[PDB]
From Swiss-Prot:
The lineage of its organism: Eukaryota, Metazoa, Chordata, Craniata, Vertebrata. Transmembrane segments: none annotated. The chain holds residues 546 to 917 of 922 of the full protein. Induction: Induced at protein level in response to cell-cell contact inhibition, as a result of increased protein stability. Residues 45-374 form the HECT domain. The record marks 347 as: Required for ubiquitin-thioester formation. The WW domains mediate interaction with PPxY motif-containing proteins. It is found in: Cytoplasm; Cell membrane; Nucleus; Cell junction. This is NEDD4-like E3 ubiquitin-protein ligase WWP1. Auto-ubiquitinated and ubiquitinated by RNF11.
Length: 374
């Protein structure tokens, strides 16, 4: 968003100064890639991954170049991320980035594999290698130890989000009663209970606490069924790249560091945008497009994650954007008044754009929302 270039160079320098001598060799077959990569990497010390890397596919091919590193991180990235291994699964369907599968527990060694994946993604970052990862912004928030907001919820469970929203800005009734600081959970035949805090199953939710309740229910919704997995992943990543080295980045910057910056096709974007209470002839829309045309590609990318929840576009361009209902094109809807700030609903690839009075005001308001979002 701003001094991102500086933060990036700073990270690069940090990795360079921490580089370790000698090297590590990785011998894997083009179709046993996942399993052998796992065995070899886990048999090495985590700091060994900070040494030079020599990946020799014993599909016993070419001669030389970190093009194989790039291919490896690319390939393995799709294998580890492939839901066929039961570690990760897909989000809002038939879409694409991914989520830690609560049922990974089937594999009794899933935690060993999550540690491996964490080491591998930290390794990619340490060597400035890009991966086709599908991690969500909130997962990145977790990596950075940034508290999840109720907005983050909106992009994961619209139903859960709607109930917590009501509980928030609204006093308990005509729809509300007794709720406690516990959750009476999922997957297992027991009919049991989980406390959100010490003795929580006995603490009634009131019109004074409810704010902590909301906080605790949000975090629980994100890590439910995946706490162990998440911890295993972060511990592995941390041994290779200390999470502290990332403290200056926000979740949107972290995503870009892993997938890489890409150019946005403005014509594809414009012809595949839909509108609500706005038209291509609305002055606000004419200004919106003039604004996207004028700014940096980095601003464009931040705007995409603000609205869609990611900087990555599916194969096929904007015409293929998906929601949790199937087709969900980029949408701009008019709301509130010119004094409001723009807002978004990533689950719907929707931007709420107040009817501003001038280009300058639109520009100023969008930029603030795009960068200052937190």
């Amino acid at each position: 968003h701003m001094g991102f270039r500086w933060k990036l160079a700073h990270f690069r320098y940090l990795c360079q100064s921490n580089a370790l001598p000698s090297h590590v060799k990785i011998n894997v077959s083009r179709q046993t890639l996942f399993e052998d990569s796992f065995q070899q990497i886990m048999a090495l010390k985590p700091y060994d991954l900070r040494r030079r890397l020599y990946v020799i596919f014993r599909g016993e091919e070419g001669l030389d170049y970190g093009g194989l590193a790039r291919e490896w991180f690319f390939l393995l990235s799709h294998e580890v991320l492939n839901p066929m291994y039961c570690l990760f699964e897909y989000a809002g369907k038939n879409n694409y980035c991914l989520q830690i599968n609560p049922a990974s527990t089937i594999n009794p060694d899933h935690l060993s594999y999550f540690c491996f994946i964490g080491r591998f993604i930290a390794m990619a970052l340490f060597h400035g290698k890009f991966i086709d990862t599908g991690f969500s912004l909130p997962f990145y928030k977790r990596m950075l130890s940034k508290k999840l907001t109720i907005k983050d919820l909106e992009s994961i469970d619209t139903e859960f989000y709607n109930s917590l929203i009501w509980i928030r800005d609204n006093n308990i009734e005509e729809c509300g009663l007794e709720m406690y600081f516990s959750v009476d959970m999922e997957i297992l035949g027991k009919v049991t209970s989980h406390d959100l805090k010490l003795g929580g199953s006995n603490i009634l939710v009131t019109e004074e606490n409810k704010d902590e309740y909301i906080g605790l229910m949000t975090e629980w919704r994100f890590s439910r069924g995946v706490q162990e997995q998440t911890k295993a992943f972060l511990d592995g990543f941390n041994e290779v790249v200390p999470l502290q080295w990332l403290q200056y980045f926000d979740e949107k910057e972290l995503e870009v560091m892993l997938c890489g910056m890409q150019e946005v096709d403005l014509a594809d974007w414009q012809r595949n945008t839909v509108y609500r209470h706005y038209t291509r002839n609305s002055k606000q829309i004419i200004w919106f497009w003039q604004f996207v045309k004028e700014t940096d590609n980095e601003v464009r990318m931040r705007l995409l994650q603000f609205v869609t929840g990611t900087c990555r576009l599916p194969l096929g361009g904007f015409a293929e954007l998906m929601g949790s209902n199937g087709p969900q094109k980029f949408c701009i809807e008019k709301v509130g008044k010119d004094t409001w700030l723009p807002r978004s609903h990533t689950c719907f690839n929707r931007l709420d754009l107040p009817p501003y009075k001038s280009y300058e005001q639109l520009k100023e308001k969008l930029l603030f929302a795009i960068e200052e979002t937190e």
